[PDB]
């Protein structure tokens, strides 16, 4: 069914990133300590990782196919607010964000956000 399909097609992507060179750092969720920036939840009000996505994805957390796509543009958003232009991270998301953003025409996903925004 249609709602089925672009869940299979969001879980597919989800795991393309994950498994994307470098992808690795926004796998989980930050934690402020460990990677050494403690005011990361001072600047970053809105997080998101590949495994928040894939827990909603599981548990049917998703109404329309382009909350998928604002949750995953939510990563790259935080990655370039927290981090400075030209930092290995913020270079990765760079390249995982252009990467997404191709996976969403080659597979066909945009066209469910089309017929999905006509039916509102
Ligand atoms: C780099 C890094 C490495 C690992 C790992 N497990 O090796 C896990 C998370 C992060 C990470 N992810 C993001 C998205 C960030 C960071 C920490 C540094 C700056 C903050 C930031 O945005
Ligand atoms: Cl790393």
Same mark, same amino acid.
């Given at each position: 069914? /249609?709602?089925?399909?672009?869940?299979?097609?969001?879980?597919?992507?989800?795991? #393309?990133? #994950?498994?994307?060179?470098?992808?690795?750092?926004?796998?989980?969720? !930050? &934690?402020? =300590?460990?990677?050494?920036?403690? &005011?990361?939840? &001072? !600047?970053?009000?809105?997080?998101?990782? /590949?495994?928040?996505? =894939?827990?909603? $994805?599981?548990?049917?957390?998703?109404?329309?196919?382009?909350? /998928?796509?604002?949750?995953?543009? $939510?990563? /790259?958003?935080?990655? #370039?607010?927290?981090?400075? #232009?030209?930092?290995?991270?913020?270079?990765?998301?760079?390249?995982?964000?252009?990467?997404?953003?191709?996976?969403?025409?080659?597979?066909?996903?945009?066209?469910?956000?089309?017929?999905?925004?006509?039916?509102?």
């Amino acid at each position: 069914s /249609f709602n089925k399909q672009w869940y299979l097609l969001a879980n597919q992507i989800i795991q #393309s990133l #994950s498994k994307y060179e470098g992808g690795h750092i926004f796998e989980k969720l !930050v &934690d402020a =300590k460990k990677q050494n920036c403690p &005011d990361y939840y &001072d !600047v970053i009000k809105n997080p998101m990782s /590949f495994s928040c996505v =894939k827990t909603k $994805l599981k548990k049917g957390q998703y109404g329309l196919p382009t909350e /998928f796509i604002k949750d995953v543009q $939510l990563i /790259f958003d935080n990655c #370039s607010l927290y981090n400075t #232009s030209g930092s290995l991270v913020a270079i990765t998301g760079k390249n995982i964000e252009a990467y997404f953003n191709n996976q969403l025409i080659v597979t066909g996903y945009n066209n469910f956000v089309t017929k999905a925004n006509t039916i509102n």
